[PDB]
Subunit: 352 residues, 4 copies
């Protein structure tokens, strides 16, 4: 019957280590670590792609409409963030290689680079990094480096629906936004307008003081920010600039989930939103730890005469944060008592 | 020109994932995680073997005699412990699989098991786990599973010099033990004997009391422990039982390094000893985390035949599997600093770089 | 104006470090690390108690009956396990102290011990460690080591409802167990009986066969044992189990129907309770390994004894893995009744 | 007899938790976590200061001259980095607080901020962050927020010798730099010059491939030869783009290249550890940024944007140790150190 090594195809996995230093008659011990570290990253990238694809499919094929499937969705997205955390920690292993020792085999690698990781690109694309928003390296598209079936795979990855698009569509259907129903947006605008009015009166009532002056200034900022939320044209503009990514309606859905997270139907949805932010934060942390290591190994100016260091530093940016809108919902937090009430009267549609 | 995927042989690594659930017409999503997790463990086991073999070779071929090589030795042993820590954390990934989901593909795995990891066994053997100390599973030898070249490799792993044996030989050469020289052992025995004598007199002077008895009783325990160190015959006996692993002379070398760790020639040696203990501790932590997960997935009774896997694995979390137990137990023989034989520059020339 | 240091009462927190080595005219550098490490453990124990008490209260006052409160419950229990993981990692700091350096100030500590952590005991009791199940230290009860108000607090901690008891009561009310309703237990027994019957027949149709026969026999005994309420009561008496038979039924209902909307967050709670038990055990294990490294080959053997199912409060949740069946044996839940969850 | 609680002064530590939400008649559960998290950070900052001060003192009092003390030095610096790692992981606890829940007690905190952590500033100063290099927040000096004894302490922290300065002095005394002795710098310049000559010949002996090699050679040549420009170094020192004296830089490179030599093994570990502390300090700052973002948004001079600015070489004290990787050469170019000339090492 089945044996461990055969089941795991270890005849492949453990016969995939060839030191170029050794192939060229000058074996360097630490090259082995370099190979294994990358192979382990690639195994885990494959696992992340497997989870991510399964979740994309749940959205894309309509299964997510049945809320029974939310546990699996959140459990798999949580699993992705648990793997990503391990991948961040994994840099600690390669940090046991000194720059001096790396320098003894670096020449035998040229011109290969991590830039050519198919899976890393697939992962970026499938989460929803927009091609127009990528920073070019040496004034080139990232995919220009790939050919054949690999280029085909990358194209599919760009053309098929991303996790961002699939979550967007689902957020747009969030219960409670219906004007004929709970009319979340209408009530929210009204309550925020009234809340600001009340606050203005409170501040104006205060005795002339430095404190008052500050409160006035703060109020003015807060007022502008909160009212700006209801400007759909500003949203479209920011969407155009890439400072936002979600449709206006999806943003409404996300805020509905945020404010009514304790309501039973929104509990697991809220966890999903939290998890999407976690993935974005951990992807950025991966990129940051990668940058620090490139610096430690090559210096601040080495790279393909573009500085790899500086290109990579540019990737550590909201430009590569797909669910940046979920983070920015913090900007629009209001006092709890301003949140449109959901009494049992109307608290029927958010029970399981 | 060399390309990433070719250099890393990703055509092998990323085409090694076959779900038995799918091969048998009933694909179960979480099986993929189970495969990848194990493959990642095995890659890192290969890396640990590569580091450990390189260090064994440095000892075995005499390179360690040139102390310029101690930095490399300690850096590679430190690297092994950094990998082991990652491997302990890696269980957190498999903990995202529920027992209920594992149960949907478990049947398609039988009768394969992690028990059949060649590399894990190679690692245990090369560090220095003794075959006669291993606990039998279902009243069977661990090697009974393996056949052909695999069984051959395991035998070599048992017959070749282990890390423990190679460190032992090097410890036996530790400077300072020469009776004609610094005479560490003789001076230590003398100072401990005198120190105990002095302490006894202090205690005896006290007036008969419960407190005095307690002090007297404590002194007697401490006395027995410390003096037991100089009983070479007791050591040989305990070595016979497998309760100790290092030769008496190697034990002397280790304690020399412990007590004179700050002396320049002993600084990196001390770090090495620390690192060997770290590896033992992390190997045990791996075993423990593995146990907790087997329990969560299979329950306390599930296992091959009437034997419980859980209970066998629990049994592996024991000093029986701690190769450098003697290095840990040197803390038992701590004395006041002023009892430590002095090493004035006059007699320090030998421990300078 | 509120200032950081005043808000955090740093005049207290950062003036609480007194080296006994220094008080006795022989300052030892590493003693400072020993003090801070323990103070950090105690701050986090206080936080764990704060979370755990808030959750006990949500159960005890009936708030948990409104399922709107489940997110907060699971979020706070998850928070406890996140803190416990940090506390496990925190041992890595104290591991930078050698045994030789510890030995230079150890004498000045006597006769104080970590054993006397009030908060650690409060935490054990509030989770649900039973006093009669504790391993004796020096042939005596753990509480004998405490006096005054502290002894009083520990008694309250034992007498007040534990997390285990409060979860138990909630599990007993789990929807689906009603014989007049979905009749989970009845259907489960029936389906397991049938499933075993079917398997036997297949088996009856070789070395392999012998093995499968053996397996079947073990599985059969185990699965049928689940329906023996008397054996359960006996094991409860021996302390080998902790939850009532009815609570066990509730937990299995949640396990099997975890995807059903009303059970999704409850399942996360059960998962989290096991996590806390596992991390508490890991804390105890890492503590043992450190004591060994510091003192040698005994407190060591008493501590080793605490790394046991004896101190696993939610051991019943772990052991439900033993009673997993093929998915197709699980009583079906369709719209006919599905709506109840 | 001493009791645990008394020894640890738990009557202070465990009676230091006062929720402002509760003081103002509206207790918010998560405020307790916010307080404890910060108190735990501050305990560990105290420990880091205690280790760092002990190491500064070993340098400053001449004890480091006795190489017996290098193990203690490196062990304590390693300990600092192990604590810093825990402090980075500790953010995972505060991340279990949602922004919505933080928003329920945030108002009761105003106008307090982590910016007012005395110990964090003391730590920055004692490692060697320069005041003139700090980025202003809201067009203000960082110390403007401190008064009394606290401001006094911060002054001393700036005036007293920093870890950077103490390491610098020790690096300047590194064996091997003597022109009358092993003459490291002279030999290195000579070997690099010759090595470049040899490579040029190979290039001349040879297309776009050749052209690429030509371009590379030119870049490498400029970089490597720039190392021997003492004047450029002094200029960059003036700007604050470098921190170590030219002589200290030579000492560091000596240790780098001859790390395996017994006398340099633990010194090399020290240099590695100093870089680790810089990396971990930056990682702390970055994890802090990500959290502030999640909690306040990108707008709430935005704190988020100021903090992002602190993740920069501007705050990297041992940047020179990192940048020595730029000046790596083939091993065979490194001046040989035969036992003959090894006795000193
Ligand atoms: C010695 C360690 C490392 C060095 C020196 C290094 C160097 C670099 C450099 C210079 C680049 C920029 C592209 C180029 O100029 O060729 C790059 C990009 C990249 N590296 Fe690494 N790398 C290291 C480790 C790793 C590891 C362990 C991974 C894991 C898979 C990795 C994955 C990547 C990826 C995916 C990119 C492209 C990132 C992007 O375009 O945003 N590298 N690396
Ligand atoms: C679902 C997760 C896991 C389960 C249920 C599991 C189960 C078991 C069981 C029952 C045994 C005892 C042997 C037997 O009865 O066949 C065992 C041993 C073993 N497992 Fe696991 N295991 C799991 C994950 C892993 C992983 C991730 C590794 C990593 C390589 C691993 C490596 C091993 C090894 C090396 C042994 C032999 C250990 C020894 O003999 O001391 N297992 N496992
Ligand atoms: C040098 C480090 C440590 C040593 C040598 C040590 C030693 C011991 C010993 C010997 C015991 C058994 C009781 C006794 O005989 O006194 C004990 C119990 C205990 N220690 Fe530690 N300990 C250390 C660190 C810590 C730390 C950092 C904590 C954190 C709070 C801690 C908490 C405890 C607790 C709570 C107990 C009672 C455990 C139980 O009864 O299950 N210890 N310790
Ligand atoms: C809810 C979590 C947190 C938020 C929202 C937060 C927010 C901020 C903000 C906005 C700043 C910029 C200064 C200001 O605008 O007042 C800041 C700075 C700072 N925070 Fe935090 N913080 C948080 C947690 C922490 C924690 C856990 C620490 C640990 C002690 C901390 C320590 C600091 C320090 C030291 C600074 C000054 C850093 C520098 O000047 O480079 N904060 N924080
Ligand atoms: C496999 C193979 C190589 C890599 C690298 C990688 C990327 C860039 C590197 C490098 C290694 N060594 N030096 N550089 C800089 C380039 C600059 C242009 N000229 C050639 C060297 C990362 N991961 C890998 C996996
Ligand atoms: C690859 C393949 C299998 C494994 C296991 C593993 C070990 C024991 C297992 C198991 C999986 N599932 N059930 N058991 C218990 C046996 C007991 C005898 N009857 C059949 C099931 C761990 N790692 C692996 C890697
Ligand atoms: C504060 C003060 C002391 C401690 C300890 C602790 C516990 C036991 C210790 C110890 C330190 N040093 N030696 N022992 C062994 C004892 C055991 C009982 N019989 C006498 C020797 C842990 N945490 C602390 C906090
Ligand atoms: C103790 C007390 C407060 C803090 C903070 C902190 C920092 C900035 C904060 C905050 C809490 N709540 N809101 N803000 C935004 C302010 C920034 C300045 N302009 C007005 C809004 C961090 N650690 C602490 C410890
Ligand atoms: C029926 C539904 N699952 C409704 C839905 C959409 N988005 C949501 C977010 C939270 C809660 C529910 C929803 C669907 O249309 O998918
Ligand atoms: C020359 C020598 N390296 C001496 C030696 C042996 N063991 C040691 C431990 C610590 C310090 C030195 C030694 C050798 O024989 O290997
Ligand atoms: C009304 C109820 N919340 C029902 C209940 C009890 N235990 C459960 C477990 C999972 C799901 C629901 C329940 C209550 O009685 O608390
Ligand atoms: C005697 C000496 N410890 C020499 C010294 C200085 N820097 C070094 C770096 C590495 C090795 C030795 C040194 C001292 O002057 O401190």
């Amino acid at each position: 019957g089945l044996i461990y090594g055969n089941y795991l195809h270890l005849e492949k996995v453990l016969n995939a280590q060839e030191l170029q230093s050794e192939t060229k008659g000058n074996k360097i011990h630490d090259e082995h670590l370099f190979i294994i570290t990358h192979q382990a990253y690639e195994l885990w990238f494959k696992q992340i792609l497997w989870e991510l694809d399964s979740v994309r499919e749940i959205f894309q094929n309509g299964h997510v409409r049945d809320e029974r499937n939310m546990l699996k969705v959140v459990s798999r997205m949580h699993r992705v963030s648990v793997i990503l955390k391990l991948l961040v920690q994994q840099f600690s292993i390669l940090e046991t290689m000194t720059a001096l020792d790396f320098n003894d085999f670096r020449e035998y690698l040229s011109p290969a680079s991590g830039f050519q990781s198919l899976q890393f690109r697939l992962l970026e694309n499938k989460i929803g990094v927009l091609q127009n928003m990528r920073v070019p390296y040496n004034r080139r598209h990232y995919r220009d480096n790939f050919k054949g079936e690999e280029n085909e795979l990358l194209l599919k990855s760009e053309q098929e629906k991303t996790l961002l698009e699939l979550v967007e569509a689902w957020l747009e259907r969030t219960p409670g936004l219906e004007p004929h129903g709970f009319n979340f947006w209408g009530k929210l605008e009204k309550n925020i307008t009234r809340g600001l009015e009340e606050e203005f009166i409170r501040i104006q009532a205060k005795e002339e003081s430095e404190e008052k002056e500050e409160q006035v200034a703060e109020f003015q900022k807060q007022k502008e920010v909160l009212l700006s939320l209801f400007d759909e044209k500003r949203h479209e503009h920011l969407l155009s600039k890439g400072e936002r990514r979600l449709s206006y309606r999806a943003l409404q859905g996300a805020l509905m989930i945020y404010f009514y997270r304790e309501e039973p139907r929104f509990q697991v949805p809220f966890q999903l939103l939290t998890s999407l932010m976690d993935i974005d934060s951990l992807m950025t942390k991966w990129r940051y730890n990668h940058v620090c290591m490139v610096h430690r190994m090559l210096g601040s100016k080495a790279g393909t005469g573009s500085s790899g260091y500086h290109y990579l530093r540019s990737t550590v940016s909201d430009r590569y944060k797909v669910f940046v809108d979920l983070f920015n919902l913090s900007t629009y937090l209001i006092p709890r008592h301003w949140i449109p009430k959901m009494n049992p009267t109307i608290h029927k549609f958010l029970e399981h």
